[PDB]
Design a protein around this nucleic acid. Structure first.
Lengths: 143, 48, 50, 111, 100, 116
RNA sequence: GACAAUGGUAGGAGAGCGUUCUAAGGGCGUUGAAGCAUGAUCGUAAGGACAUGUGGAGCGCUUAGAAGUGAGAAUGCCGGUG
RNA sequence: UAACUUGGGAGUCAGAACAUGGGUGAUAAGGUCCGUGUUCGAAAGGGAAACAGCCCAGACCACCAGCUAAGGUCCCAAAAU
RNA sequence: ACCGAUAGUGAACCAGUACCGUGAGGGAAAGGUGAAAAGCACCCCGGAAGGGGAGUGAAAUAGAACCUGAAACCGUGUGCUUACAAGUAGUCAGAGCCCGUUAAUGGGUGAUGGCGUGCCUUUUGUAGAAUGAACCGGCGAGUUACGAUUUGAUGCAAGGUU
């Protein structure tokens, strides 16, 4: 029994920034989710948070494929009899580009106590300027 | 001697008791089966 | 409508969180020297001064 | 050191006794007497006598001063139950429990 | 430095001045045992390759021949009146490394 | 002779209650409730003991893959290369050297690529 | 040493644990027996010891014999308490 | 590597699904009755989201050791963006 | 090689008594201070019950509701932990905090991750919304007599045996 385990006293977390110019919504989300969970680190521990912070700029100007502009619908319920609402992906991109990116990424993370916290390290901004300059974010190149 | 008594080998055997737990092998139904005339107390049919 | 299940002692102690009494709200009487109810007389001498 | 007094088999239910007991824990000797004399409960006269009898022991059997005394322990136990009956409708009867309690008070000088 | 040895199925990394636990060996208490199978040698020096290093034994001293903590094995089948209870203690060997 | 019970039933039930120390509510107090939980505990341990080996093997592979991605090569490609050279080092020893001596693991990566 | 076998309901076969009493032999006990509580102890299982508190007068060990010999369920019986 | 004979002791006589050849029904039924196999019954483990009977495969006990079957390798979720 | 107070007569105590029924009739529960009553003189709180000292006794938590005194259940204080969380309540992995044993690769607690729909009965098939149990303790079900057959042991043997 010589397997190493990581705890809160020997974990270093970093900040990265990713630009969403001309990237598919699902393909950008697939790679980003693996960074928040720390799967790219060699000291990965399934019961301890080892991820890194992620900043995504340019929430708008993200491209779909096919007829997803008007054929992709998001439904929700208000827990009232007969109350169901819907909105298309095209409308959601220009009324709220930030919520579109968050939902796609957050649906790729486990729905546990630790998973609900690892998703709190994602920051999405519609424009091209972010107010987190006190940290040391580095540009990230997609694989 | 009265304090070392050994019966003849192979001449004594302990009896079998049924209905004394499931590990013995005859616990619940005591070797009778399920829901029959022969599973009741009072016998089955005549020998003939 | 009988209870469906037995109530455990964890639920019973939780329910009695607010089942309590408090102090009457006594004040010192500057004629008798011992405590008395506010806006009432001193039981030792019957002095509702002021 | 500690002085105590116990009263056994008092015709009061233990659940009702503990309501007044929680108001005197850790109180001053004069404060505890004042609280018990100003509450309109059924067990207030009974508990006060146990406290006043516990202070008398601390002043006679031991050389203490009754101005720095505090209440260190105050609890109620339960005793034997008196089982009565009450006739309900349709010819049957229901049981009635008359419970008793043991009241204890401990006063400590400190140290 | 560190070395990689195998003591039957398993593989373990060792260093000079370290106590290890392995499976039972025929050696008595207090005697000296050597490991003749090394797959990797690391540390400050040049890392040695594989499948096996030509030579490069590892020696250690035997401390005791004990047995592990007892564990209870219990299984049963629902509604079928079947159950079983067993106990198990697994012997081990304690060694302390002194030279590579 | 009349054989009456005593000091046998009580001594056998208190062993079950002792085995249930630390349980929630009545599961550490009542014999009938506590007895059922002990049988479930024994069944769980037998299953989890064999399942414990699969979980730790999947952890080593995850850490090996992450360390191999930094050398522009994949896990399924690295392990194929090692067997060509006959390294014969399991996942447990591969993971430990990939976090202790990051320079030592680089030597093995080069050897795997040489064998294609 | 060498090899081979060991999932299991109804049911068939074998080896064992524990309780009460009796015979013989040999022991313990007011410098403390049975019983009761705790402990991080032992055997492949039913189970067996040791130490400490309470307890105040009886009780184990070996080989044999006998049986009112083992409890979680029967809208079971009696008492106590939620 | 099993078969046969003579003796002691039993249990069983409510079966189910799937593949295949038929009767009946309506080339209906998770329908019903026959022949021939597998599984469940009395079988835990892996796959089919969960799902006795389908696919792979039959648990003496212990290990933080290796290779494979059915099904799989973008994230949940181990393995090829 | 019979029981030892749920046992043994229904009755170990003034039991065919209490109690129930118009009547014939049915029918309980309740044993234990100490060797010796030596059964607490006297002091303090009350109206009393009760309690704290002193004293008798080897022992008074042996104080007459009196030998030991388990469980359910009810209260007081403490070490660790808990108010963003979807729980057959456990098991495997695991930092942090508090202790130190029948001294052994120790004990208590538990931020997080994985797996996981009680037990018995009856059924082709039950997490089943099919049955049973509120909980704890005690009692509660293949036995004996006489014959038949078969297997093992032992004594004698064309004889064996009451």
């Amino acid at each position: 029994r010589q397997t190493f385990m990581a705890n809160e006293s020997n974990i270093e977390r970093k900040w990265y920034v990713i630009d969403a110019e001309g990237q598919t919504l699902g393909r950008l989300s697939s790679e980003v989710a693996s960074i928040l969970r720390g799967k790219n680190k060699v000291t990965y521990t399934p019961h301890v948070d080892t991820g890194d912070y992620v900043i995504v700029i340019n929430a708008s100007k993200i491209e779909f494929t096919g007829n997803k502009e008007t054929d992709k619908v998001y439904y929700r319920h208000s827990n009232h009899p007969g109350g169901i609402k819907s909105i298309t992906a095209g409308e959601l991109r220009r009324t709220n580009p930030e919520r579109l990116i968050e939902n796609s990424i957050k649906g790729m993370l486990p729905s546990t106590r630790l998973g609900e916290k690892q998703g709190k390290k994602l920051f999405v901004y519609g424009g091209a300027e972010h107010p987190h300059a006190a940290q040391q974010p580095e540009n990230y190149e997609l694989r | 001697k009265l304090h070392e008594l050994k019966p003849a080998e192979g001449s004594r055997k302990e009896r079998n008791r049924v209905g004394r737990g499931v590990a013995t092998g005859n616990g619940k139904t005591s070797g009778r089966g399920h829901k029959g005339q022969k599973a009741r107390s009072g016998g089955g049919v005549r020998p003939g | 409508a009988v209870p469906k299940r037995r109530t455990s002692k964890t639920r019973k102690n939780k329910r009695r969180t607010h089942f309590k009494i408090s102090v009457p709200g006594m004040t010192e009487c500057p004629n008798c020297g011992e405590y008395k109810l506010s806006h009432r007389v001193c039981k030792n001498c019957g002095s509702y001064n002021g | 050191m500690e002085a105590k007094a116990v009263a056994r088999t008092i015709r009061i239910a233990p659940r009702k006794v503990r309501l007044v007991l929680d108001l005197i824990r850790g109180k001053n000797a004069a404060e505890a007497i004042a609280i018990l004399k100003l509450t309109n409960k059924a067990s207030s006269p009974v508990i006060e006598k146990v406290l006043m009898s516990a202070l008398a022991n601390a002043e006679h059997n031991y050389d203490m001063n009754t101005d720095e005394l505090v209440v260190k322990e105050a609890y109620a136990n339960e005793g034997p139950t008196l089982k009565r009956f009450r006739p309900r409708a349709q010819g049957r009867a229901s049981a009635i429990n008359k419970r008793t309690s043991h009241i204890t008070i401990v006063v400590s000088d400190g140290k | 430095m560190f070395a990689i040895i195998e003591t039957g199925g398993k593989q373990i990394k060792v260093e000079e001045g370290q106590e290890i636990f392995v499976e039972k060996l025929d050696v008595n208490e207090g005697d000296t045992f050597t490991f003749d199978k090394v797959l990797f040698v690391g540390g400050d020096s040049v890392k040695v390759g594989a499948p096996t290093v030509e030579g490069a034994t590892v020696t250690a001293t035997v401390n005791k021949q004990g047995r592990g903590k007892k564990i209870t094995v219990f299984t049963y089948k629902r509604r079928k009146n079947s159950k079983r209870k067993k106990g198990h203690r697994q012997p081990y060997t304690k060694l302390t490394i002194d030279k590579i | 002779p009349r054989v009456k019970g005593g000091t046998v039933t009580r001594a056998r039930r208190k062993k079950t209650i002792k085995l249930a120390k630390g349980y929630f509510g009545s599961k550490h107090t009542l014999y009938k409730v506590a007895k059922q939980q002990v049988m479930k505990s024994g069944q769980y341990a037998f299953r989890d003991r064999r399942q414990r080996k699969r979980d730790f093997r999947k952890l080593w592979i995850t850490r090996i893959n992450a360390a191999a991605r930094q050398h522009e090569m994949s896990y399924s490609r690295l392990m194929n290369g090692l067997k060509k050279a006959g390294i014969d080092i399991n996942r447990k020893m591969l993971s430990e050297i990939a976090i202790s001596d990051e320079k030592a693991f680089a030597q093995l990566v080069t050897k795997a690529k040489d064998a294609l």
